Amino acid sequence: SDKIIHLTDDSFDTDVLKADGAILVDFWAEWCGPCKMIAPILDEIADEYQGKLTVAKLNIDQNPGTAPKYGIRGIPTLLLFKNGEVAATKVGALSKGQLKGFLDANLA
Ligand SMILES: [Cu+2]
Ligand SMILES: [Cu+2]
């Protein structure tokens, strides 16, 4: 959890929309089973992609305002932003290999 940015509804604009470069945002909640499975994978990816990608999390129970702005209707949802704009998204459980495939297809 040492390389994961903690987001809130209040900080989302500064931390995500005003960040330079690429940021992967995980929308999650404690009641979401697949969210728990992907959490350690996100730590691995935050290290492996350090320098090319920042990884962030937003808990939708505690910060319920942001997900509706992206039409998010299921979790986990991963949003990949580049320079403040969504480039690609993924909904649902995925393996480490699927996550790396998603990132490699969207990051140089
Ligand atoms: Cu960590
Ligand atoms: Cu918090």
PDB file of C-alpha atoms and ligand atoms in Angstrom:
ATOM      1  CA  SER A   1       0.000   0.000   0.000  1.00  0.00           C
ATOM      2  CA  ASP A   2       3.122   2.155   0.081  1.00  0.00           C
ATOM      3  CA  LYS A   3       2.814   3.319  -3.536  1.00  0.00           C
ATOM      4  CA  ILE A   4      -0.975   3.735  -3.739  1.00  0.00           C
ATOM      5  CA  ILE A   5      -2.453   7.225  -3.741  1.00  0.00           C
ATOM      6  CA  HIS A   6      -5.492   7.538  -1.496  1.00  0.00           C
ATOM      7  CA  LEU A   7      -8.194   9.554  -3.243  1.00  0.00           C
ATOM      8  CA  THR A   8     -11.316  11.286  -1.968  1.00  0.00           C
ATOM      9  CA  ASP A   9     -14.179  13.041  -3.732  1.00  0.00           C
ATOM     10  CA  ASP A  10     -12.574  16.307  -2.605  1.00  0.00           C
ATOM     11  CA  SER A  11      -9.056  15.466  -3.859  1.00  0.00           C
ATOM     12  CA  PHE A  12      -9.961  13.701  -7.111  1.00  0.00           C
ATOM     13  CA  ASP A  13      -9.629  16.773  -9.325  1.00  0.00           C
ATOM     14  CA  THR A  14      -6.182  17.749  -8.036  1.00  0.00           C
ATOM     15  CA  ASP A  15      -4.789  14.219  -7.708  1.00  0.00           C
ATOM     16  CA  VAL A  16      -6.153  12.767 -10.963  1.00  0.00           C
ATOM     17  CA  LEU A  17      -7.459  15.383 -13.375  1.00  0.00           C
ATOM     18  CA  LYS A  18      -4.499  17.688 -12.675  1.00  0.00           C
ATOM     19  CA  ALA A  19      -1.839  14.965 -12.509  1.00  0.00           C
ATOM     20  CA  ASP A  20       0.644  14.740 -15.343  1.00  0.00           C
ATOM     21  CA  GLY A  21       0.857  11.529 -17.231  1.00  0.00           C
ATOM     22  CA  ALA A  22      -0.766   8.265 -16.521  1.00  0.00           C
ATOM     23  CA  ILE A  23      -2.800   7.343 -13.469  1.00  0.00           C
ATOM     24  CA  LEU A  24      -4.710   4.117 -12.852  1.00  0.00           C
ATOM     25  CA  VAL A  25      -7.660   4.597 -10.466  1.00  0.00           C
ATOM     26  CA  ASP A  26      -9.257   1.623  -8.708  1.00  0.00           C
ATOM     27  CA  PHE A  27     -12.876   2.212  -7.595  1.00  0.00           C
ATOM     28  CA  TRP A  28     -13.600  -0.263  -4.792  1.00  0.00           C
ATOM     29  CA  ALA A  29     -15.547  -1.004  -1.593  1.00  0.00           C
ATOM     30  CA  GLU A  30     -15.338  -3.476   1.268  1.00  0.00           C
ATOM     31  CA  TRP A  31     -18.438  -5.357   0.122  1.00  0.00           C
ATOM     32  CA  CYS A  32     -16.820  -6.097  -3.270  1.00  0.00           C
ATOM     33  CA  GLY A  33     -15.209  -9.536  -3.327  1.00  0.00           C
ATOM     34  CA  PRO A  34     -13.149  -9.110  -6.499  1.00  0.00           C
ATOM     35  CA  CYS A  35     -11.853  -5.789  -5.198  1.00  0.00           C
ATOM     36  CA  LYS A  36     -10.048  -7.664  -2.428  1.00  0.00           C
ATOM     37  CA  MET A  37      -8.450 -10.086  -4.861  1.00  0.00           C
ATOM     38  CA  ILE A  38      -7.032  -7.330  -7.084  1.00  0.00           C
ATOM     39  CA  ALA A  39      -5.596  -5.241  -4.200  1.00  0.00           C
ATOM     40  CA  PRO A  40      -2.217  -7.063  -3.908  1.00  0.00           C
ATOM     41  CA  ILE A  41      -1.927  -7.149  -7.697  1.00  0.00           C
ATOM     42  CA  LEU A  42      -2.210  -3.369  -7.777  1.00  0.00           C
ATOM     43  CA  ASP A  43       0.756  -3.123  -5.377  1.00  0.00           C
ATOM     44  CA  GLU A  44       2.844  -5.288  -7.718  1.00  0.00           C
ATOM     45  CA  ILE A  45       1.822  -3.149 -10.705  1.00  0.00           C
ATOM     46  CA  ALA A  46       2.524   0.122  -8.874  1.00  0.00           C
ATOM     47  CA  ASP A  47       6.107  -1.028  -8.380  1.00  0.00           C
ATOM     48  CA  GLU A  48       6.583  -2.614 -11.809  1.00  0.00           C
ATOM     49  CA  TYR A  49       5.256   0.449 -13.634  1.00  0.00           C
ATOM     50  CA  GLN A  50       6.832   3.071 -11.365  1.00  0.00           C
ATOM     51  CA  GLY A  51       8.019   6.005 -13.448  1.00  0.00           C
ATOM     52  CA  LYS A  52       5.378   5.378 -16.095  1.00  0.00           C
ATOM     53  CA  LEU A  53       2.233   5.070 -13.994  1.00  0.00           C
ATOM     54  CA  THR A  54       0.777   6.158 -10.660  1.00  0.00           C
ATOM     55  CA  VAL A  55      -1.823   3.922  -9.020  1.00  0.00           C
ATOM     56  CA  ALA A  56      -4.657   5.311  -6.898  1.00  0.00           C
ATOM     57  CA  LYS A  57      -7.738   4.069  -5.042  1.00  0.00           C
ATOM     58  CA  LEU A  58     -11.136   5.573  -4.304  1.00  0.00           C
ATOM     59  CA  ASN A  59     -13.503   3.869  -1.878  1.00  0.00           C
ATOM     60  CA  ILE A  60     -16.976   4.470  -3.293  1.00  0.00           C
ATOM     61  CA  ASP A  61     -18.798   3.963   0.035  1.00  0.00           C
ATOM     62  CA  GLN A  62     -16.773   6.750   1.681  1.00  0.00           C
ATOM     63  CA  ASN A  63     -16.582   8.889  -1.472  1.00  0.00           C
ATOM     64  CA  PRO A  64     -19.840   8.270  -3.336  1.00  0.00           C
ATOM     65  CA  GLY A  65     -19.744  11.375  -5.551  1.00  0.00           C
ATOM     66  CA  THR A  66     -17.067  10.510  -8.094  1.00  0.00           C
ATOM     67  CA  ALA A  67     -18.163   7.153  -9.571  1.00  0.00           C
ATOM     68  CA  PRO A  68     -21.435   8.517 -11.054  1.00  0.00           C
ATOM     69  CA  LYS A  69     -19.386  11.151 -12.965  1.00  0.00           C
ATOM     70  CA  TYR A  70     -17.798   8.278 -14.900  1.00  0.00           C
ATOM     71  CA  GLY A  71     -20.987   6.221 -15.257  1.00  0.00           C
ATOM     72  CA  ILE A  72     -19.546   3.489 -13.028  1.00  0.00           C
ATOM     73  CA  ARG A  73     -22.194   0.893 -12.218  1.00  0.00           C
ATOM     74  CA  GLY A  74     -20.040  -2.021 -11.089  1.00  0.00           C
ATOM     75  CA  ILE A  75     -16.837  -2.533  -9.135  1.00  0.00           C
ATOM     76  CA  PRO A  76     -14.013  -3.064  -9.257  1.00  0.00           C
ATOM     77  CA  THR A  77     -13.640  -0.484 -11.998  1.00  0.00           C
ATOM     78  CA  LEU A  78     -10.195   0.564 -13.197  1.00  0.00           C
ATOM     79  CA  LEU A  79      -9.975   3.929 -15.007  1.00  0.00           C
ATOM     80  CA  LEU A  80      -6.733   4.725 -16.822  1.00  0.00           C
ATOM     81  CA  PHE A  81      -6.264   8.475 -17.227  1.00  0.00           C
ATOM     82  CA  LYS A  82      -3.648  10.161 -19.385  1.00  0.00           C
ATOM     83  CA  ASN A  83      -3.216  13.900 -18.839  1.00  0.00           C
ATOM     84  CA  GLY A  84      -6.475  14.216 -17.028  1.00  0.00           C
ATOM     85  CA  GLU A  85      -8.664  12.353 -19.517  1.00  0.00           C
ATOM     86  CA  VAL A  86      -9.866   8.758 -19.454  1.00  0.00           C
ATOM     87  CA  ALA A  87      -8.065   6.632 -22.024  1.00  0.00           C
ATOM     88  CA  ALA A  88      -9.462   3.177 -21.194  1.00  0.00           C
ATOM     89  CA  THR A  89     -11.394   1.360 -18.481  1.00  0.00           C
ATOM     90  CA  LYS A  90     -11.927  -2.187 -17.221  1.00  0.00           C
ATOM     91  CA  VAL A  91     -14.756  -3.554 -15.080  1.00  0.00           C
ATOM     92  CA  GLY A  92     -14.545  -6.677 -12.930  1.00  0.00           C
ATOM     93  CA  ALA A  93     -12.025  -9.081 -11.530  1.00  0.00           C
ATOM     94  CA  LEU A  94      -8.920  -9.639 -13.587  1.00  0.00           C
ATOM     95  CA  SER A  95      -5.664 -11.501 -13.217  1.00  0.00           C
ATOM     96  CA  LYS A  96      -2.207  -9.974 -13.036  1.00  0.00           C
ATOM     97  CA  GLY A  97      -1.590 -10.986 -16.647  1.00  0.00           C
ATOM     98  CA  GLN A  98      -4.828  -9.354 -17.770  1.00  0.00           C
ATOM     99  CA  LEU A  99      -3.921  -6.161 -15.902  1.00  0.00           C
ATOM    100  CA  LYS A 100      -0.466  -6.042 -17.494  1.00  0.00           C
ATOM    101  CA  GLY A 101      -2.022  -6.700 -20.900  1.00  0.00           C
ATOM    102  CA  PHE A 102      -4.412  -3.766 -20.353  1.00  0.00           C
ATOM    103  CA  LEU A 103      -1.626  -1.456 -19.270  1.00  0.00           C
ATOM    104  CA  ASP A 104       0.809  -2.494 -21.986  1.00  0.00           C
ATOM    105  CA  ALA A 105      -1.866  -1.927 -24.651  1.00  0.00           C
ATOM    106  CA  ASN A 106      -2.432   1.638 -23.381  1.00  0.00           C
ATOM    107  CA  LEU A 107       1.008   2.803 -22.121  1.00  0.00           C
ATOM    108  CA  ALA A 108       4.022   3.123 -24.363  1.00  0.00           C
TER     109      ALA A 108
HETATM  110 CU    CU B   1       2.847  -0.685  -0.569  1.00  0.00          CU
HETATM  111 CU    CU B   2      -9.732   7.316   3.221  1.00  0.00          CU
END
